[PDB]
Structures are given as C-alpha cells and as structure tokens.
Amino acid sequence: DISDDFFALFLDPTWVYTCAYFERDDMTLEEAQLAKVDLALDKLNLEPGMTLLDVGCGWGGALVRAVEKYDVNVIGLTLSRNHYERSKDRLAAIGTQRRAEARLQGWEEFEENVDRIVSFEAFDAFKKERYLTFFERSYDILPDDGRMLLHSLFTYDRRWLHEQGIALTMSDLRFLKFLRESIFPGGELPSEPDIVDNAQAAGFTIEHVQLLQQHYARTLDAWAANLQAARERAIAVQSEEVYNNFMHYLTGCAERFRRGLINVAQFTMTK
Numbered sequence: 624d625i626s627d628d629f630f631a632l633f634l635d636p637t638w639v640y641t642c643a644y645f646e647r648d649d650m651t652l653e654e655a656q657l658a659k660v661d662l663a664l665d666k667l668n669l670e671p672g673m674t675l676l677d678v679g680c681g682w683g684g685a686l687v688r689a690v691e692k693y694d695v696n697v698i699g700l701t702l703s704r705n706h707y708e709r710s711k712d713r714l715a716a717i718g719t720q721r722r723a724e725a726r727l728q729g730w731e732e733f734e735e736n737v738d739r740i741v742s743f744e745a746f747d748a749f750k751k752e753r754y755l756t757f758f759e760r761s762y763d764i765l766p767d768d769g770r771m772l773l774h775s776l777f778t779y780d781r782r783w784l785h786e787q788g789i790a791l792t793m794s795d796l797r798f799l800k801f802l803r804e805s806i807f808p809g810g811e812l813p814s815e816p817d818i819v820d821n822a823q824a825a826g827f828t829i830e831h832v833q834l835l836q837q838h839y840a841r842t843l844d845a846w847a848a849n850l851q852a853a854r855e856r857a858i859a860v861q862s863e864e865v866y867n868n869f870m871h872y873l874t875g876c877a878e879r880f881r882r883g884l885i886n887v888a889q890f891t892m893t894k
C-alpha cells in the first residue's frame with residue numbers, strides 16, 4: 624500500500640486522517656484535529672478511568688488524545704497493520720498508568736465490555752451487510768448508560784440532492800468510479816438512513832447530529848495544499864502517478880463537500 628512516509632507529508636502531527644473541526648477560524652490543522660477529537664469525546668461524558676473503545680483507530684491520534692486529556696483507559700481497533708504499528712508505538716510512549724492498547728482486530732471479533740465508544744470514519748469501510756450488526760455489537764458491549772459517538776461520512780441520493788438544488792454530473796460519476804477503482808474512501812458510502820435506521824433498530828437514541836460538511840472541504844483543501852508543497856518528496860516516496868491520484872482525490876473530494884454532494888457528521892448515540 625501507501626507508506627506512512629507519504630502521509631507524513633500532508634497530515635498534521637496527530638496523524639488524524641478524517642474531517643477536522645475548525646472550532647475557531649484561525650486554528651491550524653493540528654488544533655482543528657484535536658478540536659474534532661475533543662468535540663466527539665466531550666459528547667461521551669468521559670470520567671477518568673473509564674474505558675474508551677476507538678473503532679477504526681487509524682494511526683492512534685484520538686486514542687493518544689483520549690489518554691492525555693481525558694485520562695481514560697483506551698482500546699483501539701484497526702484492520703491496517705501500519706495504523707496498528709503506529710498506534711501501538713504512540714500509546715506505549717505515553718506515560719500513563721491507564722491501560723492503552725492498540726489491536727489489529729476488527730470490531731466483529733471484539734466482545735469486551737467498554738464504557739463508551741468513538742469511531743471516526745470507519746463506518747464507511749464496513750459492508751452494508753454489517754451495518755445493523757455493528758450497532759447491535761456496539762449496543763451489547765456498552766453499559767446501560769453507555770454512549771457512542773459515531774463520526775461518519777454519508778451520501779445523498781438523486782432525489783434528495785435535487786430537492787436541495789444539487790445535481791450529480793457526469794464528472795461526479797467518473798469521480799465516484801475513480802474513488803472505487805483506486806485505494807480511496809468514498810466509493811461505497813452509507814446513506815444517512817443506513818446510519819440512523821440501523822442504529823435505532825439496535826436500540827440507540829440519536830441524541831444529536833452535528834454536520835461538518837464545510838469543515839471537511841477545508842480539511843481536504845489543507846491536505847492538498849500540504850501535499851503539493853511536498854510534491855517532490857511525495858513522488859520520491861511513491862511515484863508521480865500516486866501523487867497525482869492523491870491530489871485528484873483530495874481536491875475532488877473537497878469540491879464535492881463544498882457542493883454538498885456528500886456529508887460527514889457526528890451522531891451522538893445513547894441507550
């Protein structure tokens with residue numbers, strides 16, 4: 624796949640690779656990623672010593688933030704070995720008496736009780752045949768007053784787009800195919816009902832939905848600006864083909880968030 628050394632060229636030091644939250648207009652990318660993590664974690668009412676599960680933990684930035692700021696025990700799951708390795712190393716380098724572990728393990732295999740769950744843009748990598756199963760499992764491992772913050776992309780169909788004044792162009796269709804044909808997220812996104820209806824069928828209440836559509840446009844712009852500024856190094860680490868593909872993905876996604884063709888939101892999920 625793609626080396627960490629490539630992503631290092633355009634991500635901030637948290638390594639967070641999901642929609643940031645520019646809670647103040649003048650935050651840096653790193654401040655906005657920490658703000659996004661805190662925005663989610665604040666909704667979980669974490670007390671020191673609870674155990675937080677991060678489903679799809681990436682390179683571990685949210686787990687690290689959870690330990691440092693919220694003083695919780697943490698378990699992170701990922702299917703990526705590179706994500707696991709960096710999460711493992713970063714968590715072991717935190718000085719904490721709490722338990723902090725990363726695992727190369729799917730949520731499908733995880734059955735331990737935890738106090739709270741967070742997940743940032745893992746849900747779109749799940750097969751649609753697992754949407755309900757995911758919420759059922761999440762419900763089962765939470766306590767009676769547990770909470771889950773699901774941060775997920777989602778898409779709109781033609782009918783909804785049109786009522787909002789938006790059309791899918793021939794270009795957008797080719798872009799979707801480009802996303803599916805390469806190694807990028809966004810080709811098989813859930814609908815909002817896919818999230819909400821399956822979560823409710825599993826027993827969750829949707830307490831709050833916070834849309835972050837334009838924050839993702841800004842996030843993607845920043846990643847693209849960073850990658851372009853490091854173009855020579857990116858080509859050296861991977862290739863010009865990969866570099867141009869990533870720039871197409873970053874700028875193309877940014878355009879479509881700005882246009883409103885897709886969205887991203889934090890769903891506060893209670894029992």
Ligand SMILES: Nc1ncnc2c1ncn2[C@@H]1O[C@H](CSCC[C@H](N)C(=O)O)[C@@H](O)[C@H]1O
Binds near residue numbers: 742
């Ligand atoms: N079934 C599954 N169980 C656990 N992790 C999964 C998963 N399917 C995908 N993932 C993980 O979800 C992550 C999606 S990328 C998002 C990374 C991180 N949450 C961030 O905010 O930057 C990857 O680590 C991927 O391996």
